[PDB]
Amino acid sequence: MEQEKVQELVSQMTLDEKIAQCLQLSPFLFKGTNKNAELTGPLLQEMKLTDAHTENAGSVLGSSSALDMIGIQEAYLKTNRLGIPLVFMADVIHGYKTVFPIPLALGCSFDRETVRVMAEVSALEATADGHHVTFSPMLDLVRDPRWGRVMESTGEDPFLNSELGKAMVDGYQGDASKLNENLEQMAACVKHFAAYGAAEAGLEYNTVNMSTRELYQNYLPAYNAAIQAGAKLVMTAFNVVDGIPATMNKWLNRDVLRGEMEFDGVLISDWGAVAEVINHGTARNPKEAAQFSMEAGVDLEMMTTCYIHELKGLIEEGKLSENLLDEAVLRMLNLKNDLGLFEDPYRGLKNNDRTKDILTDESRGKARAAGVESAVLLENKSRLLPLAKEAKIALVGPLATSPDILGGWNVYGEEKDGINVETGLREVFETVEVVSTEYTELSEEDKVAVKAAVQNMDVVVLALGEKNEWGGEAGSLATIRLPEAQYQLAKFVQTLGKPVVITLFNGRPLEVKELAESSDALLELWFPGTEAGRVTADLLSGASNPSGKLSMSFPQTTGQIPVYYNHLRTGRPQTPENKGERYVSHYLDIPNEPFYPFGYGKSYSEFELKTSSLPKELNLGESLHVEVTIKNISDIAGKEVIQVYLQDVTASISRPVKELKAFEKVALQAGEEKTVTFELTSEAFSFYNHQLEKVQEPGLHRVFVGTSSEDVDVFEVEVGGYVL
Amino acid sequence: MEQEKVQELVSQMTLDEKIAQCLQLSPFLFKGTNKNAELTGPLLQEMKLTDAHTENAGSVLGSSSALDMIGIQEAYLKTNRLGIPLVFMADVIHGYKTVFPIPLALGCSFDRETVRVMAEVSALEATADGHHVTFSPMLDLVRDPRWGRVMESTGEDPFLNSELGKAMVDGYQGDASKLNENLEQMAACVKHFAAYGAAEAGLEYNTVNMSTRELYQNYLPAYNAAIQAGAKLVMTAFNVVDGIPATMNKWLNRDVLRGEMEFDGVLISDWGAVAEVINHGTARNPKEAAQFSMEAGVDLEMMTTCYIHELKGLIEEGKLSENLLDEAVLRMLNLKNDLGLFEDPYRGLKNNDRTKDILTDESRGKARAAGVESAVLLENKSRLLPLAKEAKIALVGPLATSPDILGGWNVYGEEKDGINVETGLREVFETVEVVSTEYTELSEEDKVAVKAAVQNMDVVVLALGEKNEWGGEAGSLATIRLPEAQYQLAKFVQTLGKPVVITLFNGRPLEVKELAESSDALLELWFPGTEAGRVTADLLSGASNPSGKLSMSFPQTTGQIPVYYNHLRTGRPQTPENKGERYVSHYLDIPNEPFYPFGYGKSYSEFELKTSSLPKELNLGESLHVEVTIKNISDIAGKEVIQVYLQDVTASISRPVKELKAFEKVALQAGEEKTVTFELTSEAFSFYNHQLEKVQEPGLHRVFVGTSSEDVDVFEVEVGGYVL
Ligand SMILES: [Mg+2]
Ligand SMILES: [Mg+2]
């Protein structure tokens, strides 16, 4: 509908209708839900919600199916005075029913098109089941693998996160101006604004603190990239940002998000985040939480009742302008209009059952393809991998038969539909003997069984990993290790005399030195999703060639954290020419380097790269064009991730030793040679200064081209002169 | 001498004289040195120092004795055109020749007079050997025990650190306006400005980043207290402060230190820190490092040559004003004048050998008394301790005979004069059987020997600990544990069936859970210094009753770091009533609490405290007066540390759940009752807001009175109304 009619709606709503429009509730709080209806009465009484509230609520979170949505929307539209339909939002993080790899695994793909496809299939299925918005992409920069929510991020680099974040928004939304027409696409919600990943000591919900300059340099750019790409919603964070809970942080939400970033869509709170500003100690009670969160521009309160019980009295008393409420209501109505809800409240589902679009073979192949792009081969000593299909496999460990391979933040996917590692391997390999063990125990009886299977077979596939419940939200581990029984298993297996490949399933970096050292090969599968066992079997057999690279550093030990590639030099850097000396930046007990670094991953192929002649000088404002020729010099087709880093050698702020500023994943047949070109615009040479200006300073830069943050050639370019 | 004569010297100096005045050198680079002459020739040539340089240098760093100083000062005044004497500075951190407990241990004293006395004895001795300045106190806030320099701080609380920092300054300097007269006192130098202890991942020299608000709230207050108390010098930090190395950080040093804190004394670089701004990537060469460090107001370059080689040219070219150089030279001369050097360049020694004042028995008693104030009794199950004098002791482990008990940052104290554990115990206990073991090994032969000693004796004193080289500067450990052999030893000893006291020597918080669980008693002696074994023997025997309290949190595990008592609440605090829920701030694998908290320590006595009726309301600006009556209800004389904390319940910034605002250590005979009073001024209720204003907000505060951050009675005070 026309914008005039939208605005007219706001004019016609009562104060109570406008207040309720800013409330989001679980489906079973509404009449006409088809699930959990025995929870309805108790919870409504406990939250003190009336019919007047639920019949005028703005939104539903977490509908259970198309039938829930239709049931609820239908009943809601019977009683709603002005006919303003509900918007339905959902947690579609890395797939709906077809589960794709966890986001941190998709980071390791270094593949924008993989991420777009994942988001596209996700939207196709989610919209089929009646959802209009997804709480994705998660764009929090992560440097602390203790935090369980690292599995939701694409990792430690703000550029990679920015690029994959745009890819995701594109896949979910397509052309954002046509979400009223394109009913298999859905709105995206950027989260969590801001800097939630910097939680102190990796403890869930814990304090975040950094300078404003560091906030702008590293923690804000991916949110911004996604917002500029057209993300329809933004979600507040649970953490403080410089002492003020994000949800009621007026500078953050009005000045930065709506002002500098020009965001004009719905700002939704995280779950209970409005009420929880009380717990943080920055509102005395629900009246203050309401006032402060509305002053900060939060339009939609997720499943708490500060707005509903408090806004009327704040507005009647003069403590809050009713204009702020109108602006909130207008953004809610505009989202709904963007989604086409005023013309079709069922968004394409009424008399059009799309059950058929969910969990198709094509979608499944897309998830397998995403898993084989995202896995990272970490060790492969002596061409153990790929295994011949006649290789006799002892498959042992807790991940041998476990169905827990879909990952965390899997709200709708079912383990019954997933492929476990044994099933996967039995499709490819004729001889497999299986010995499952428990995640946290290694019995005498287990060791006898393991010894017997290994003795029978020729190679060991040792499948280890985390339960998905050990990460995700409020899955903080102080010590980033598997259960000790797993490391003891890897040590035991090593003693049996046969080659060992460890296939590792997990949602965070872990201490894997003891694994690498106890095996011949190590393949990091993360959690690949629905097609996990086929992903594993294809990579092991070489049907697919590993091509992922780490998007997050793997520390030597828990106490190295935070460790990350884009770090400052310090006044006393360790150099090859001072190593051994006391008075340099080092630890007494471990290396400075992480166990594996950013951008690292192996392949069954071998590649040679060469960079075309670059200029020695550049003007201010001028781009550097970087041409790279890459040849596959082996007999095995595969993919390499070309990476380009820049360094600012001297600056008015100490700058990182490297920052990723371009990447492309190149597929090459045996012998095949391609040339790829990168433009590093003057923005790539710029940074935030002490006064928080975005600046380019004349001076020396290094340019690094290669295949990890360590395997690079280096070139120097002197920036100066006049500005273009 | 008169100020007009000081100003006149500046007017008369050549530019080359002025530039060299801003240089500090090791003693052996001066003619007249009486040690390390063999080092002089090569080092002069590598630094490209000539006689016009050394005969005009401003200061000496680390003279080895009174004779070195005299020889150096005599030779230099033969050749110095204008007669400007050298100022001699040294590292007197917790004692000169009589070594007191390490600063972290003095923090655990919670005793201002103990710290004052340590600094007084240190000055008595240091001045007797010809030093004019000490590079103490170290006032860096510490929350990360990986960092080896925690041993130099008084811990994680800015209030405690503030109070003991003032006590040290008062102890070294006395009345600072009479340093030309009181030649047994010396100038103090606050260090390291600023925020060096926040080194990321506890890695030496590594990145520091925090919000400006946090910097003011927690990281600057102790430096400020010591500056306000009259500290003569300040030293720059090695780390970046919001991206800019502190040494050339103009905002920090000009605006904050000289402007806001009104510091008008010498700003000395840390070692090489002027040249190292190059390494940090914020100066291209020595010419820029010099410019920027002089613009930031650094007056004295410690052992690098940026100033001496580049200033003349920067001044001649007009890139740098000669006025900044004159200001530096004037501060350097004012310092020398404050020390009386223009009337007596030898500061009391030239006709007065004060060898007599060094390592006196009186001073050794003060060091013992400081050790028994500072140890912390952590466990004492079944009144194992105190031991009777006739107890038959098996003394075993790496600390049974090690002479390494004087601590890190012991530049001048000698182990031959210290008292090891065996020696201390044999002065008190008639029956001691000793079995020494290595710091990092536990052999079969050791076990046989330990088992035999234990079989013969009735109790085990298991003496464990760190080598001092495992901490201090560039002594970072990624895992805060002793060598695994020591934990294996404690496990072994526990099997022998006799009661065990572990006496632990160390410079940082360690993971001690396994030690607490493997023993009946645990006594944290840190490194007590010269009288270490006597301190140990008195506490074990009850001649002294332990009275120390932790000034830094002891983590459950390395991965809990940072953990500290003055933390924010978060949006989802763990409460005793949401125990067991997933969606709260917690770890899956450990408690949120540290193993032991701030302000905890045991005693051989028992106390009861009672707080007198407090007001329910208070005006803004008004003090709260807190009166507490304490009684020793045991038969044993003892000291208890009464602590008072404040919490700001609701604020415009999320405030810590507690902060210490008053403490007093109270000595009580058996059955003795005392009353003490505390004034919490309105400044105790104040904090820095979003705009960096120091404010007091009306509202609810809680007041906590007790004997730890956990063992408290709580009271509520509503603050508002008018301002008083
Ligand atoms: Mg530059
Ligand atoms: Mg308050």
Numbering used by the authors:
A (entry chain B), B (entry chain A): 1 to 724
Structure paper excerpt:
In the gene cluster containing the lin1839 gene, the lin1840 gene encodes a putative glycoside hydrolase family (GH) 3 β-glucosidase (BGL) (GenBank accession number: CAC97071.1). The structure showed that Lin1840r forms a dimer of identical subunits each composed of three domains.
The crystal structure of apo wild-type (WT) Lin1840r was determined at 1.8 Å resolution. Lin1840r shows a similar overall structure to that of JMB19063. A loop (amino acids 568–598) in Lin1840r extends into the active site of the other subunit to form a part of the substrate pocket as in the case of the corresponding loop of JMB19063. Therefore, the formation of the dimer is predicted to be important for the catalysis. In domain 2, the helix and loop (amino acids 435–455) extending to the active site in JMB19063 are missing in Lin1840r. In domain 3, clear electron density was observed. The metal ion obviously undergoes six-coordination with the side chain of Asp648, the backbone carbonyl of Thr650, and four water molecules. A distance between side chain carboxyl oxygen atoms of Asp270 and Glu473 is approximately 6.0 Å, suggesting that the enzyme follows retaining mechanism.
